Structure formats: structure tokens, C-alpha cells
């Protein structure tokens, strides 16, 4: 989707807010910590999302005005809500009512429950991770060193193909192997893995600029075609 999230190459967002590492506080509000717990806790159990693909599309679907103002963990809250409702884990009406309760009475008590089995399960997920690497029977269409065409495609659903790289020539830098295909997986349409490549693009090609800059982007096979 050609959304507000896809910012690469945009002008006008201003200076980067530099801060020294030691002063770069992770969390300033408890709800931000909670957002992390919600995301990892749900994902570890496959609730609403099993990999990050579905997670990302829920963020991408935010109203632009929300995306730009919610703050970062606001994205995480938005996508957990989106995905839990979308998959039928939570009912939208119930979620909205409960939201209203905490809006009007922020000090409403949170129910307590200990589940050490669930802790172990979550811990296992944090340490084991979840690799999207798969094997497929096909061979790679492209080879290291090949000049390829990064296609002009405009999926309305999820994609990992940034707009700034579309309709451009690039050079294959590496064949990673086959990875779960985001444009399908984010919409629960199957892993349908495809070869993933790293592709180098020159500044002259991306922007028409004259400096010694390049961008290395990872692109799925179906994003590209031979020249």
C-alpha cells in the first residue's frame, strides 16, 4: 500500500532529533511498556498475528493523522487492536466500551493473573525467534551481478517494496534464499515463499543525484523482472 508509512525519499520531515544514547529513554509512559507486552505476548501465542507481516499491515492501515501523532507505541496499540478484532479474538463493540471505561476512569483496576506456563512460552518465543526462511523446489530467477528491473507495481494491500525503488534498475547483490512472502502472508493468504534478494540501487538511478551514495534493499523475486 502506498501509505503514509512509506516515507523513503520524502522531503519536509525536518531535522533528525539527535539525542545522546545515555539520555535516549526507552519508555516515558507505562502504557508504552504495556504495548510491548501486548505485542510480544499475543504474537508468542499466534493471537491476531503469527509473524510480523500481519502486524505491519495493521500499522500501515492507520489514519495518516494518527500515524503521525500517536507516537511509536501508539502504532503497536493500533495494530494489536486491529488484528485481534480482524481475526475474531476480540469484539469491536466490547473493545470500544472497555476503552471508554479507561478513558473516563483511568485508575480502573487491571485484573491480575499469574500463568507461569504462559511466561515460559513467551520467553521461548523471545529467545527462539521465528525465522521466515523456507525451502522451495524452484531455482532463483536472478543471479548475483544481474541487472534487473524493479517493477512498477502498486499493490493495494501490504508490500515490502518501497515506492522510491519502483520502476528502477538495480543489481543483484545476494540471493538470500526463499522467505515467507509478505504481500500474501500479511493478509493470511499463505506463506507462499519466494526467493529474497538484496539489490543495490545507485543514487543517480533513484534520485538523479550525483554523490557516491547507494541503497541496498531486500526485494522478493516477484517485485522484479529481467532486462
Amino acid at each position: 500500500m502506498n501509505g503514509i508509512h512509506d516515507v523513503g525519499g520524502m522531503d519536509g520531515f525536518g531535522k533528525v532529533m539527535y539525542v545522546k544514547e545515555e539520555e535516549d529513554i526507552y519508555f516515558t509512559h507505562d502504557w508504552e511498556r504495556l504495548a510491548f507486552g501486548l505485542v510480544a505476548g499475543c504474537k508468542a501465542q499466534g493471537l491476531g498475528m503469527k509473524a510480523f507481516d500481519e502486524f505491519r499491515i495493521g500499522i500501515e492501515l492507520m489514519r495518516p493523522v494518527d500515524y503521525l501523532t500517536s507516537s511509536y507505541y501508539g502504532h503497536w496499540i493500533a495494530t494489536v487492536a486491529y488484528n485481534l478484532v480482524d481475526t475474531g479474538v476480540l469484539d469491536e463493540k466490547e473493545l470500544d466500551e472497555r476503552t471508554e471505561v479507561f478513558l473516563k476512569k483511568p485508575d480502573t483496576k487491571i485484573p491480575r493473573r499469574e500463568d507461569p506456563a504462559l511466561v515460559k512460552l513467551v520467553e521461548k518465543a523471545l529467545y527462539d525467534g521465528l525465522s521466515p526462511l523456507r525451502e522451495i523446489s524452484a531455482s532463483p530467477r536472478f543471479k548475483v551481478g544481474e541487472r534487473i528491473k524493479a517493477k512498477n507495481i502498486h499493490p493495494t494491500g501490504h508490500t515490502r517494496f518501497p515506492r522510491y525503488a519502483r520502476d528502477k534498475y538495480g543489481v543483484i547483490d545476494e540471493v538470500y534464499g526463499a522467505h515467507v512472502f509478505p504481500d500474501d502472508a500479511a493478509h493470511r493468504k499463505g506463506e507462499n515463499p519466494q526467493y529474497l534478494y538484496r539489490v543495490r540501487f545507485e543514487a543517480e538511478e533513484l534520485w538523479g543525484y550525483k554523490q557516491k551514495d547507494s541503497v541496498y534493499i531486500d526485494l522478493w523475486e516477484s517485485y522484479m523482472e529481467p532486462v
Binding site: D11, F13, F27, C42, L47, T99, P106, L133
Partner: protein, 202 residues
Amino acid sequence: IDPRFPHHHPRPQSFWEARAKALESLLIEKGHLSSDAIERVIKHYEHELGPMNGAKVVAKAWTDPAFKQRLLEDSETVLRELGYYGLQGEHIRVVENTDTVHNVVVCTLCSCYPWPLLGLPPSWYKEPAYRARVVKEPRQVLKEFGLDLPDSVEIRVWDRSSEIRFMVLPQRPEGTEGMTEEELAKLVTRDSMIGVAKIEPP
């Protein structure tokens, strides 16, 4: 709110806070989450992980030529052997800064960052200014961090559009003769492993 213009009106951050609590409450009531599962995650990301892990890998590379060689040849095997592996760190690559090549890592589409090796990303890393600009004018972005590279130095920006993650291996600075591996590790900054800074002489 004029119903022609609902899109002018953002949710306040109090909404997200309330929404978070509502999700937490409903999921615990339904048996999907527990208090201790949520806390376990918070402990991991706020306290257990951090850039010190990457710093140790950098210092080892500086002090042990054979290790640096193995790391650059097959980073994913080497990093997994060290235990720097996990969620968002399943496939970690390492790219070396050299005198004429400077590496910078970004996730233009979101925030992708190798938590198991580096901990949580910088505030600015996740925000639009860095994300938008670094792929197009990296020299201008780097200058805002105090890094003013000569035109003759090539910049390679690594946009994390897949689950493959990258760490930058920065060069050992002058003035470090005789330092131990542990002492060199204390020199390695988070920013240097993203590519937005060189390491200063001590």
C-alpha cells in the same frame, strides 16, 4: 467535529493509553494473557537486552583477527554461536566500515532493528525524518549527527525491507593501543553500530 473533516482530528495520546489498558484487561479476563507474561516481556526489552552485546562483538572483532574473519564470512552462524539470537535477530548480517566505505542502516518502512544484538532502536530511528531522508541525502543526515564525510567516501544505506538485519562494524579509533578487549568494548557506541557515528579516540 465537522463530519466533512474527521481526518483533521488525531486521536489524543490518552486514547492510545486507554486502548492499551482495555486490551490488557480484556485479554487477561479471557485467559489470553497474564500479568507475569506481560511483565516478562517488559523486563526483557527494557533491561535484559541492549547495545552492550553488539559492543562485545565489535571489540572481539577488533582484537581477534580470526574471529573478525569468521564474522564477516558467516555472521549468522557466528552470532548464533555467541547466543545473540532471538526475536527480530534470527538473521543478522555485519558490514564493515572502511576508509572509503561508510555503512548506514535504516528501516524506511517502519523500525526494524536487531533487538537481540542491539536492544531497542534509538528514538529518532523510528521517526519519519531519519527514515525519509537517510536513503536520499545520507550526507545531510550524517552531518546532523556530527559526521561530515568527504565526497570521496562512498555511502551504502541498508534499507531493512525484509527480516534480514544488519549491524555496522565501525573502525577502531586511534589512541587505543594497549587497551584490553573489555576496555575497547566500552568505547563502542550504539550509534556507531547503526552507522550514524564514528568512534572517537579516547
